[PDB]
Design an enzyme around this catalytic site. Structure first.
Site, PDB file in Angstrom:
ATOM      1  N   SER A 114       0.821  -1.232  -0.079  1.00  0.00           N
ATOM      2  CA  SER A 114       0.035  -0.028  -0.136  1.00  0.00           C
ATOM      3  C   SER A 114       0.660   1.340   0.055  1.00  0.00           C
ATOM      4  O   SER A 114       1.926   1.304   0.532  1.00  0.00           O
ATOM      5  CB  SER A 114      -0.937  -0.008   1.182  1.00  0.00           C
ATOM      6  OG  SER A 114      -0.237  -0.016   2.471  1.00  0.00           O
ATOM      7  N   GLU A 156       9.082  -7.639 -21.060  1.00  0.00           N
ATOM      8  CA  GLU A 156       8.082  -7.630 -21.874  1.00  0.00           C
ATOM      9  C   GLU A 156       7.093  -6.441 -21.529  1.00  0.00           C
ATOM     10  O   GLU A 156       6.469  -5.659 -22.332  1.00  0.00           O
ATOM     11  CB  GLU A 156       7.511  -8.709 -22.609  1.00  0.00           C
ATOM     12  CG  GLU A 156       6.784  -8.383 -23.680  1.00  0.00           C
ATOM     13  CD  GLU A 156       6.297  -9.827 -24.409  1.00  0.00           C
ATOM     14  OE1 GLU A 156       6.934 -10.901 -24.242  1.00  0.00           O
ATOM     15  OE2 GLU A 156       5.376  -9.589 -25.541  1.00  0.00           O
TER      16      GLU A 156
END
Ligand SMILES: Nc1nc2c(ncn2[C@@H]2O[C@H](COP(=O)(O)OP(=O)(O)OP(=O)(O)O)[C@@H](O)[C@H]2O)c(=O)[nH]1
Ligand SMILES: Nc1ncnc2c1ncn2[C@@H]1O[C@H](COP(=O)(O)OP(=O)(O)CP(=O)(O)O)[C@@H](O)[C@H]1O
Ligand SMILES: Nc1nc2c(ncn2[C@@H]2O[C@H](COP(=O)(O)OP(=O)(O)O)[C@@H](O)[C@H]2O)c(=O)[nH]1
Ligand SMILES: CCN(CC)c1ccc(NC(=O)c2cc3scnc3[nH]2)cc1
Ligand SMILES: [Ca+2]
Ligand SMILES: [Mg+2]
Ligand SMILES: [Mg+2]
Ligand code: NA
EC number: 3.6.5.-
Lengths: 54, 437, 427, 334
Positions: free
Chosen positions: B140, B254
């Site tokens: 978080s 990628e």
């Protein structure tokens, strides 16, 4: 419009469709930072204990 | 085959980690005891799911993951959870006292006392890797641990794993589901320190997830359980290409290539559909066109913003279920004629599509209904900078009065780091603008 | 995450005793120390306030302090008298005579080490001590003088631990002696420096509530303490019971205290209730919200319209529509956003607990960090100066070694505290 | 009891609106930087749309459409019309225009110009007004700003008595549901001094701005003729009405422009909602053919119509979202 890079397999398939063409800190640096902050917690704590001693 | 190690930091990171690995097991047919009858290669393998799981001679499939929290209560529920056998004790690291929503406390004070231990436990996994791609880090923005210790960890991983990529799944703070006030400080502080140590970060605003749970799942007041099971579905959609056979986003590298041209601007917007309630008696199944068109509704985005008033740098469509390239191209063609989709001049206007024929797996007894087809769009739009604008404004309001600052300074941090971090965010906001307009 | 409780002086021990009486009932602990409840939520966070003594019994992590045995003898013979560890009864004989100097410098100084030995023995048993809490008055001698002495010495030995207080403020409406403003001003000087949170419990407000609202002709200290124990049970609810709120004292302090010195809170409670006189009509969520924000339910005699809220916390208890809770909470802010600072976004937070207190099927506890609290210190400062300008009653103090300068200093620090609150009221 | 804020006090229109809201006793004004508002009368530059609709339990509304600048700025308007199939390059009601950048589409403008050499075909353009490119493109390099060059209508409809030029101002209100409401009351900002087609340096008779003329006030008070009079004039002079000869074209143009950008600016399924008042400027040639001049995103009103218009805004654009405890608008259906 233009479909390319079409690759198929048993699990699925992937491709690409084009519509228009175009037009770090070192380990020591880190541990100096951390220790530079630790000494300051100790200075602040020292001035507290000094203050409490007075 | 190249392995991926998942790191869950703080309460939010851990509990989301639970939701994800729970789901992963159901998808790969792995059982709570770690057994996978499908896998015939006992004690090892070169398969795609081995990217996230290692194997023991006894036939157990263990997550390549580590849970870390500066307080034990949350991880303790993992130690005694339904998937307790699944994990290995050394993978679950707990402190004694949390960071009290203090970034400085998580980063400097307590972080210093546990950072070496965590890296050691991470190294124990990396040694079991023949070719480690990198790390997926869940945390978080708001927590002292999730923000403070994460930034420290991210820094050290760039030293001990220089060539390896690092992806983030970050929970953006929302007042609806937060009893904290200093969240804007922690978010700016951790973003600044972590920015150049993260190759691609997927932000999730609890606000968006909260309203989706109310609007579409008819849940009056979503709990963290509701939010997480929905989040885990998105994360699953994003990581599915790393765990299954395919040719799109097969490695972490990628993700950077396809979604992140500029290094600093590495925050792709995620949009997911359909979200259907399990308690919905009658439901007309949605088509490829309908679910794809939903990827351009702000109400379905992981962060509420308006992509119409920005520019795209990249865009991936990740389908799961009954989908064929034909219906996708037909959907794209129609959607563009009716929607505002501007790409930056120096990018091609197109979509990288990935399809997995297996439909989205749903947690039994969960809130989500099973569907025949679903999609997750990953679009790098400058419009996500709205989330930075909101956050930085809240920051400026409090810091102008130096409110709560004394808590951070009291942990060894300099007041200057506030202004340094805020300056970085100001630069980031302007970078988005240069590209966006 | 354990909390060590301390109660000093007559007032401190009497509100402290009733506090333990109330929560011991909530956790199903009987006067003997044996659990007898139905739910198990009553136990998975009972380690916070109770040590699990041998023989399957829970013993309060409480230390009872006084300079005379009078009040502590009453505790020991009280309802939950036996529950307390007998070794944790630390008392002198001479008393303090409502003299801050006696409690802080002479009589108390003689006893303070004995108390710290008990604090140490308790702390060392804690797996992870999260902080200390003190119940006391500021108007007497022991609770006021020795209490702030204890706080000073606990901060010395545990400088990285949270130290909070439940402090009863003196008022002429409910007065024991005339020197209460002196003792109070001297104590506030200490609390501004050596506490993280101080819950200001004004006897004036407690009296007004008992008279004006609860319609009690002549309220007693017992009636005043029904309001205190109920409020204390309320603010500790999320610490004592399991919920989605995962916070210790430090985390709670971080989100509530924007500035270190400005940590004096206005407690509130709804519905207000007379002791014995029980409730038949349960309040609707709108009614709970309206009351806890009204001045009439504030335990600090301050008018929040005369200031602005820096932070606000609201703990609702009982089974209720948490949606309705939000809508009503979000309603108060959106109706009176002028009384909330705009430079602390989302400064009003809420939580819900399923278990309500005894007698009530649902309730709400209010914790407000308002700048209006300056009215409290202003009041004490006025009463202080009225006597100090003539150096009246000062011989009780100089006789114990104190100098007038120390009074002048204490006066100055509190007047500074007032100007500080006034600074942010104009922001 | 709703709340609102004011972030543009130079707004004569919404200053009146903020006042009317307070008078209902069901609206309270907050400070500039208070985020807990239901309504926002925002600024004209860099309005923070990104911070709207993120306050829990607050239905937020703003008096501006994000992205509407593309219509309300001349450079963007031309680009919008040419590139949009909904309007296209074959646009009949918009004068042919071209975008010119200082030292782009300049060589293209010449193509039409090179043909104008035919002669016997009116040739005057505006940025100011001239008859040849040489001087036209010589002063647009002297300010430094991006200017638009447009075909000047050399045969405008001229009012009698006076032989005067005039432009029409229509006020259009688009609510949160993207209903397009045309204010029934418009205004003719007229010329007082006769139109001289000889030379175009004297721009007192050519530019019909309310400010330039401040023979002011000879015919109509304030140099402003309203529909009732103008309609009567068309009936007596040209044997036609305002609704037929002109207004159908106006309603058509307004509806075409807003429907074109609707998918780009609509707040239908957004987390915040928008409305906006627009000011369309039109021009009528001697053959009663209406032309679109420009669109104003922050328009001012005529003194007489302030009370009626501003009250209308509260009724259909504000109270429609925030209700309280025959219509002066014409709804352009689509
Ligand atoms: N989506 C989601 N958000 C969560 C969850 N748990 C906590 N959060 C968010 O995290 C923020 C607070 O940080 P936490 O993760 O709880 O704290 P932490 O990372 O453990 O750091 P500490 O301060 O040391 O406790 C708030 O904004 C919460 O809304 C969760 O399970 N799911
Ligand atoms: N192509 C054209 N042919 C004839 N007259 C034109 C014209 N373009 C503009 N005008 C005249 O020039 C005047 C000013 O033009 P323009 O509309 O650009 O000014 P402006 O910036 O003041 C619009 P507004 O004041 O409403 O915001 C108009 O009133 C109109 O009389
Ligand atoms: N609420 C409450 N206040 C008390 C009680 N006893 C004393 N006080 C207040 O505390 C002050 C006297 O302090 P006291 O506790 O008697 O002094 P100590 O015993 O020497 O610490 C006076 O202002 C009283 O109003 C009590 O039982 N309840
Ligand atoms: C952070 C907002 N909320 C509501 C969500 C909240 C909840 C509880 C508290 N409680 C305390 O701070 C406290 C309890 C005790 S016992 C001794 N000292 C203390 N201090 C504060 C704020
Ligand atoms: Ca295998
Ligand atoms: Mg935590
Ligand atoms: Mg007494
Ligand atoms: Na000793």
């Amino acid at each position: 419009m233009e479909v390319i890079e079409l690759n198929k397999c048993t699990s699925g398939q992937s491709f690409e469709v084009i519509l228009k063409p175009p037009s770090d800190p070192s380990l020591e640096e880190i541990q100096k930072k951390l220790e530079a902050a630790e000494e300051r917690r100790k200075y602040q704590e020292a001035e507290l204990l000094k203050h409490l001693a007075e | 085959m190249r392995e991926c190690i998942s790191i869950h930091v703080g309460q939010a990171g851990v509990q989301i980690g639970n939701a994800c690995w729970e789901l992963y097991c159901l998808e790969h047919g792995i059982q709570p005891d770690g057994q996978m009858p499908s896998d015939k290669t006992i004690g090892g393998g070169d398969d795609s799911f081995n990217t996230f799981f290692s194997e023991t001679g006894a036939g157990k499939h263990v997550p390549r993951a580590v849970f870390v929290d500066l307080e034990p209560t949350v991880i303790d529920e993992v130690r005694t959870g339904t998937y307790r056998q699944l994990f290995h004790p050394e993978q679950l690291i707990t402190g004694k006292e949390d960071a009290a929503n203090n970034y400085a406390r998580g980063h400097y004070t307590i972080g210093k006392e546990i950072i070496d231990l965590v890296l050691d436990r991470i190294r124990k996994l990396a040694d079991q890797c023949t070719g480690l791609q990198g790390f997926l880090v869940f945390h978080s923005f708001g927590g002292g641990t999730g923000s403070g210790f994460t930034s420290l960890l991210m820094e050290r991983l760039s030293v001990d794993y220089g060539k390896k990529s690092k992806l983030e799944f970050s929970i953006y703070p929302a007042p609806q589901v937060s009893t904290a006030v200093v969240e804007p400080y922690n978010s700016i502080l951790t973003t600044h320190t972590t920015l150049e140590h993260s190759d691609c970060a997927f932000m999730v605003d609890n606000e968006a997830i909260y309203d989706i749970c109310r609007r579409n799942l008819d849940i009056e007041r979503p709990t963290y359980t509701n939010l997480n099971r929905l989040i885990s579905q998105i994360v699953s959609s994003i990581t599915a290409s790393l765990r299954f056979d395919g040719a799109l986003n097969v490695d972490l590298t990628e993700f950077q290539t396809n979604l992140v041209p500029y290094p600093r601007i590495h925050f792709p917007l995620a949009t997911y559909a359909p979200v259907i309630s399990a308690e919905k008696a009658y439901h007309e199944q949605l088509s490829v066109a309908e679910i794809t068109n939903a990827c351009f509704e702000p109400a379905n985005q992981m962060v509420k913003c308006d992509p119409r008033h920005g520019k795209y740098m990249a865009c991936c469509l990740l389908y799961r279920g009954d989908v064929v390239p034909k219906d996708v191209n037909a959907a794209i063609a129609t959607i563009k004629t009716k929607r505002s989709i501007q790409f930056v001049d120096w990018c091609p206007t197109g979509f990288k599509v990935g399809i997995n024929y297996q439909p989205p797996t749903v947690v039994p007894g969960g809130d989500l209904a099973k569907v025949q087809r679903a999609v997750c769009m990953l679009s790098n739009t400058t419009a996500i900078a709205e989330a930075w604008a909101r956050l930085d404004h809240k920051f400026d309001l409090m810091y102008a009065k130096r409110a709560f600052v004394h808590w951070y300074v009291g942990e060894g941090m300099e007041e200057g780091e506030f202004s340094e971090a805020r300056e970085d965010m100001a630069a980031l906001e302007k970078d988005y603008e240069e590209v966006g307009v | 995450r354990e909390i060590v409780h301390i109660q000093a002086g007559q007032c401190g021990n009497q509100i402290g005793a009733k506090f333990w009486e109330v929560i011991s009932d909530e956790h199903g602990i009987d006067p003997t120390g044996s659990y007898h409840g139905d739910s198990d939520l009553q136990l998975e966070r009972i380690n916070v306030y109770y040590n699990e003594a041998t023989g399957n019994k829970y013993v309060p992590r409480a230390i009872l302090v006084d300079l005379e045995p009078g009040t502590m003898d009453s505790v020991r013979s009280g309802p939950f008298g036996q529950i307390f560890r007998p070794d944790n009864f630390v008392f002198g004989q001479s008393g303090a005579g409502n003299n801050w100097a006696k409690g802080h410098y002479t009589e108390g100084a003689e006893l303070v080490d004995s108390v710290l030995d008990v604090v140490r023995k308790e702390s060392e048993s804690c797996d992870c001590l999260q902080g200390f809490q003190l119940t006391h008055s500021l108007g007497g001698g022991t609770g006021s003088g020795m209490g702030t002495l204890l706080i000073s010495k606990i901060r010395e030995e545990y400088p990285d631990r949270i130290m909070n207080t439940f402090s009863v403020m003196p008022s002429p409406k409910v007065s024991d002696t005339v020197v209460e403003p002196y003792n109070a001003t001297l104590s506030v000087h200490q609390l501004v420096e050596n506490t993280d949170e101080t819950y200001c419990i004004d006897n004036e407000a407690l009296y007004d509530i008992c008279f004006r609202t609860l319609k009690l002709t002549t309220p007693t200290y017992g009636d005043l303490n029904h309001l205190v124990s109920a409020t204390m049970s309320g603010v500790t609810t999320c610490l004592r019971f399991p919920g989605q709120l995962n916070a210790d004292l430090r985390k709670l302090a971080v989100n509530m205290v924007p500035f270190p010195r400005l940590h004096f809170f206005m407690p509130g409670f709804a519905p207000l209730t007379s002791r014995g006189s029980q409730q038949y009509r349960a309040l609707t969520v709108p009614e709970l919200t309206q009351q806890m924000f009204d001045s009439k339910n504030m335990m600090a005699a301050c008018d929040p319209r005369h200031g602005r809220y820096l932070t606000v916390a609201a703990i609702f208890r009982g089974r209720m529509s948490m949606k309705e809770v939000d809508e009503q909470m979000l309603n108060v802010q959106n109706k009176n956003s002028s009384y909330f600072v705009e430079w602390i976004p989302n400064n009003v937070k809420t939580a819900v607990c399923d278990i309500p207190p005894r007698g009530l099927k649902m309730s709400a506890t209010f914790i407000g960090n308002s700048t209006a609290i300056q009215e409290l210190f202003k009041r004490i400062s006025e009463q202080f100066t009225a006597m100090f300008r003539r150096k009246a009653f000062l011989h009780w103090y100089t006789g114990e070694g104190m100098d007038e300068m120390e009074f002048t200093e204490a006066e100055s620090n509190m007047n500074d505290l007032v100007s500080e609150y006034q600074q942010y009221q104009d922001a | 009891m709703y709340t609102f804020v004011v972030r543009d006090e130079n707004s004569s229109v919404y200053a009146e609106v903020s006042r009317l809201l307070l008078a209902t006793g069901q609206w309270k004004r907050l400070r500039k930087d208070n985020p807990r508002f239901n309504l926002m009368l925002g600024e004209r530059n860099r309005l923070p749309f990104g911070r709207l609709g993120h306050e829990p339990g607050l239905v937020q509304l703003v008096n501006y459409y994000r992205g509407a600048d593309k219509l309300c700025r001349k450079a963007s308007l031309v680009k919008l019309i040419k590139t949009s199939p909904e309007l296209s390059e074959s646009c009949t009601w918009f004068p042919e225009s071209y975008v010119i950048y200082p030292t782009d589409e300049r060589e293209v403008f010449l193509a039409a110009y090179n043909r104008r050499r035919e002669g016997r075909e009116g040739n005057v353009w505006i940025a100011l007004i001239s008859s040849e490119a040489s001087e036209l493109l010589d002063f647009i390099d002297e300010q430094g700003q991006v200017h638009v060059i447009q075909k000047y209508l050399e045969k405008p409809l001229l009012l009698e008595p006076g032989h005067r030029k005039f432009d029409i101002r229509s006020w259009v209100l688009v609510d949160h549901l993207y209903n397009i409401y045309l204010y029934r009351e418009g205004v003719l900002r007229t010329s007082s001094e006769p139109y001289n087609s000889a030379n175009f340096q004297d721009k007192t008779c050519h530019l019909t701005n309310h400010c330039i003329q401040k023979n002011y006030g000879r015919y109509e008070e304030g140099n402003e003729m309203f529909f009732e009079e103008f309609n009567q004039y068309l009936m007596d002079a040209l044997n036609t009405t305002l609704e037929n000869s002109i207004l159908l074209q106006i309603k058509h143009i307004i509806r075409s422009c807003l429907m074109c950008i609707e998918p780009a600016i609509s707040t239908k399924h957004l987390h915040y909602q928008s409305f906006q008042l627009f000011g369309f400027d039109f021009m009528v040639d001697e053959e009663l053919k209406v032309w679109l001049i420009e669109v104003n995103g922050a328009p001012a009103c005529a003194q007489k119509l302030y009370a009626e218009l501003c009250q209308g805004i509260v009724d259909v654009a504000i109270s429609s979202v925030f209700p309280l405890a025959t219509s002066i608008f014409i709804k352009l259906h689509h």
